[model samples]
Target chain A: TTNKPIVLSTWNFGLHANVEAWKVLSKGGKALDAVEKGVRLVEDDPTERSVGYGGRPDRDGRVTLDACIMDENYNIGSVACMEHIKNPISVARAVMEKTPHVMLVGDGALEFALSQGFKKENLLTAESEKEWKEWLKTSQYKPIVNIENHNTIGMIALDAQGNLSGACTTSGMAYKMHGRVGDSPIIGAGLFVDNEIGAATATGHGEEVIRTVGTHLVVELMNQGRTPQQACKEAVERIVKIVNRRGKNLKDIQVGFIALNKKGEYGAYCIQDGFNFAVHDQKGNRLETPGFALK
Target chain B: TTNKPIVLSTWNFGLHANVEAWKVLSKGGKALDAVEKGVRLVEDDPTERSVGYGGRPDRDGRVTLDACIMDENYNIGSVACMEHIKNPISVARAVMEKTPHVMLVGDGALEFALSQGFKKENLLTAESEKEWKEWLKTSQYKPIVNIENHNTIGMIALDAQGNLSGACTTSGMAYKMHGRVGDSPIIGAGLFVDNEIGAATATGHGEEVIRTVGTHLVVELMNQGRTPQQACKEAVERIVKIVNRRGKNLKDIQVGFIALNKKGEYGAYCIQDGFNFAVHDQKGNRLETPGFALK
Candidate 1:
């Protein structure tokens, strides 16, 4: 049974990110191209304060980025704490296909990007720089929630060919310590793709997600007969249990996950009620706030 | 009931690593301190080709290190693709105890280490440098086996207080592309510790480990009732199935795991034979080879 093309991503940004990915998927393209092309659009947009060009800076005011992409073959690539150079998802793919390594970081990541013909652009925009200067005065430097601060764009796509792929990118927590990298750039933690099982991606506090290996746990549950929704539900519950028990940062933290199965059925789950993800298929695009583990 | 102190590490070099860790554990020290002290000795070693000071360089001949430390309380710290810093594990602890973030990478990681009073010493030893230059002649790069090429030091310890902690450190693949980072620095991949259940650490190819979130998988398995050995065994088999079916480079690639439960029970497994780990407990220290999925 052949499944129709589908695109799924975390948060409201997925509304636009899905449009670009659908361009590739609707034309019968590979999921790899769809997910990469999808997130690259967000990486270029100047308004998304948590991603790409205008993203908030670290405590040191450097706008570092983290990203990872995975293909049906389990091929993965990533970059973290990188300064300058947008489209980290593109460089992540470059590392997957062109290099023997799965990840690159910092100046060396920049060097590899330059060698691959990617341009270096100053990532710290005037707006973000201005915000950083203000933050320095208070320098409280803590995790933020509200509108899902430092929202990472984590996307999963199932192409008409029945293949799966995923991409995740972010500026990490705003005003984080310089050089801090969260779950965004890490495979298994931020993103996971197993064509036989499904694909999943995570957003929110990277530490909680990393400790649980959130996205991988989702796919593993799907392998054990959980549907996409059930998988996401269980994984989030696990994170909540861990958090409430010893649960690092029991408050003001959110862990969200979105998944796409081979059948094109998708689901979303999070620790808090405000988490939203976009789903686009032959039925068209719509934003869905996920079931939450916490009130 | 309390479990006696035990220190476990991958490879024979762990004999020395454990000796230093024992110095702390024998005195009823914290698992955090024991794990950190154990791996720091390896970081200071001049002979280990895949870890710390004299470790082999990247394709461009720069030595970069990746490391992580996790405590019983689930607190974690990590550094990846770091240059000039010889003791990344300590810096990782500094990140955990001093900063609000969990990871620091590349140049920013270097900057953070320097800011914390870590010295900037040239990591590329003359011998490593000479060997890298000679290998650059062909510029042909590939994974190697026998005596476990690119051997990483992954250590886990259980203290008399029934606390568990872990540390993983590596120079990454020898002559790898610049900026390349593996699972060593990523929590839940190279290392995972949960006081309630157990602790696990992974060695060998970090990509494979990252794919399954290998170390975390082992700990999760233990959570589900498998002994530490059973967990390590099952996790490696899962990787084998995923690999042999698509099994990226099934040949000449080894993925090994070592695990310890809170009760002081332990286990080790790998894709191929000849994977050895050191265990130091009340019974004293000994080198042990793990069960293999491939002959």
Candidate 2:
């Protein structure tokens, strides 16, 4: 007897996020397309204040982006610290199709985005305008002090065929310089996929996550027969051990992830108190779970 | 022999920041005033994009400031997502003194800032301008994406009088829209002070950090006799366990902290690979640890 294509879903992308992405995929959208659209949906929502446009700013008061995508074929891709580009996720798809490398960065990346037909202009808004003045006046460099996971908008999708895919996006950390980039757009760090096992995505403090190759660990653990939740715990615990050996005072950063197994079951988790996500079944009905009603 | 105060310092405002705020405390500067001046230093620095004026814009291309302050006298306070207001940390100080609240958000906070004499204007900049236009032109709106811990500026300080104080300033999450706020400016999430023990400051991933009460946990853990590293690690670990239970394929998220014992010994650590900080001892010599070196 053949096994059914399993589809498990999970993530920390905000309430109404994970499910929405899954719904699209379940309704025949490609996992890649669903991943892109779901992340873009959240980023587009100003109230979510995460995963897309209108998120935290950099030190120079610019809104840059980061994203990663992976497919069942083990093909992984990402874009990081991207600026002046909307749908950076799409550009990431283009990178996978057009480039010899899996990623691009800074001027080189921007140049690539433009070459790919992206427009050129400032993405700043009125709120950002005022913040620049205040930061200058006070000389207050907050770093990544915005309070939650600062990097990587993540996505995981499972099609009815059971093909798995993952995507992640972000603007890097808050208060960063005009051109600084991180690992989120770096395929392994932010997003990972393997139809053989499952798909995974993440959002959180980047430094710790990148060091541990966050999503990659999850996939490998799943391949090793660990449950999605168990894999999550082990991966996070492994990184904590790494940080304990360094970070001066034992850094407390946390990353969150979601996964879907072959069984079509989904799960979400994060290192901190809560996570946000949305779920939509095959019927397209969506359910949102921000912070999982934490605190 | 009395123990020295733990000093948290940032070059946010400018070189003159410490002189303006600390000197006040040295010569009777109120804790609020001291934190404000120090944060203002970063807010004022056009070169420093982390704090106020010239702050980084979110994906929606907006800049908003967040800040918090605390004193050994057992007072704590904060301000979040303040747009177009130079010196949000000052407003945070005012919030501490002028209001009987722990936090204020969006336009309400802005109103409070205006009443407190902060200048009002669009918080845009050439950098933000350029980025905004480019994003619009790109029609990508995917500028905010990544895998890095954003920056947040903060200081844990000890004056000549042995009073411990903490201050933090941020531009909030990148690409965030108008009136958005997070835990950065919240006291327990971003900053914490305990005269009986030590003071603490945090930067990075506000949502989770806020959910975990990063600063408060650190202090309380210290109270429990855990070293600064231990408290920070344990706090983050607690969160990771939660993620493991709820999600699949999750990974490590780093959180970092620096602490000083009553005897003046200091510690720092993070779950991630890097963190940057500086220290100045009683003799007046400043030392910096710029996190990881390309060894």
Candidate 3:
């Protein structure tokens, strides 16, 4: 078994997350543990308003979260529209480990989390609440491209034993309607992992991701013998085609995908400029790549 | 203009629904109108426990409905986790016509429906309530293949003007988690339409359908020159591969698809037997076909 471990995350915000994940991977822990540990860092960051704690509130002033995890064995668990939980990623893990079902949501999800010994906390911080209140004055629900409002921390790791796993967590679109789940908790839409092939995750407009089944499409393209870059590019191109065909200005929306092949080849692509992804390998190593995007 | 109109639906439950949609198509009305009107029939049927009114509630005892409509213009509208609303299909259409958004969910969807003059009614009938209470005793959550519990009426139509559209609505899995939106409200998962190519819709397990992006995959395959039957079969085969590769029993879950090409050819397929679909063409002719399934 090789001990070469590599981690890839959707954006610069994942620097700390990647570092935390490395702590587990460096010790030969399973890729699932590393992924769960890595995503929890961002999920607990109070400053990251698009993640677990202190996430921006929905239009109804409630902070709802969505998260999913996929292990090398392809066992997947997800939680969506979950409220009052401090670590939705952990709750999602519990779903994978304890429940026979693959997903839980809303009140049932909260009930499950509580039963799993998760503490309830107010997820909205003062700053996030203030931003939401101010936005209520306009009530304009249009999504702004590259707004940093709904960017997800999508992380994938290939561990020492050549096992691949992934996690995606988000507060979803800022001021989105209550219970409006985006692609984050939807398998294939937000994340997909084929231990023998590779894994892919998306961070951007969840609707567009859901519409295209972005991550699964990437993995399937790889199965068709396409490279990671080719898969990511084709997924983005599909979204771009839809945008242009819909007569919508492509600049108004942004969707991005970051992918890693089983051999550790990685690539990222987006619907517009200003989206980037981070990579980490070994200890104290971090790199940023300008993602390919449509003009 | 060739005025050949046709309507197709996923199962025999859609017999009454096709009748309603045929009214609009036979009158040379728009394909969008025919789909919306047709689906509303099932959505309002108190006896149809898997659909709108009197549908089985989630584990938390809430009747959440999901529905989406796609017009020949590729305009789509959807509502998810909407409570207390009769005829979620109509509400989906209103989202397309009244709001700039393609989807609305939860409290926001309810508020929008109310704004559109939709009256809220308790969707849980006495019979469904009794079943929900009984289900609570055991609380077994495994999905049963070929069971009628998760049936959805996925309807598609080609109108007199050669326009195509589709609608899918359901209460989702019985005793599901609250706010658990399924493939029905997802544009590509449950339904997809390309005016120049074809339209596809799915029934049975929404999770499996979502993972495959079943409907969109079928339409894309048809766009690549596959016949409707060929596209439907390929989509089902992909799901079968995943099930076998995952070491999952093929009989544990059921998923089915119905497709209609722009040339008026239609086809259906499923992962197991006991699946059928309804079709209505010009001259008030209606026919039923037994769908192919893996043995």
lDDT string, candidate 2, A145-174, tens digits: 223445356667666566777767776665
Kindly report the docking quality category of candidate 2.
Answer: incorrect
TM-score of model 1, chain A?
A: 0.97
Q: Indicate which candidate wins on TM-score.
A: 1
* TM-score, structure 3 vs. true: 0.91
DockQ of each: 0.69, 0.02, 0.38
Q: Write the per-residue lDDT of candidate 3 for residues A42-83, one digit (tens) a residue.
A: 889898888899888788899999898888866778888889
Q: Rank the models by TM-score, top first.
A: 1, 3, 2
State which candidate has the highest lDDT. 1
Candidate 2 lDDT over B18-56, as tens digits, reads 555556555654545565666677677666656677776
Candidate 3 docking classification: acceptable
Give the Cα-based TM-score of candidate 2 against the true structure: 0.47
Interface RMSD per candidate:
1.5, 16.9, 3.0
lDDT by residue (tens digit), candidate 1, B1-295: 4456998999988888999999999999998899899999989988988888999999899999999999988788899888999999998888888876788888778899999999999999999999999998998988674464777898999998999999999998898888888989888899999999999998778777886788888888898899999999999898888787664656666888999998898999999887789999988989998998886
Task: Tell me which of candidates 1 and 3 scores higher on lDDT.
Answer: 1
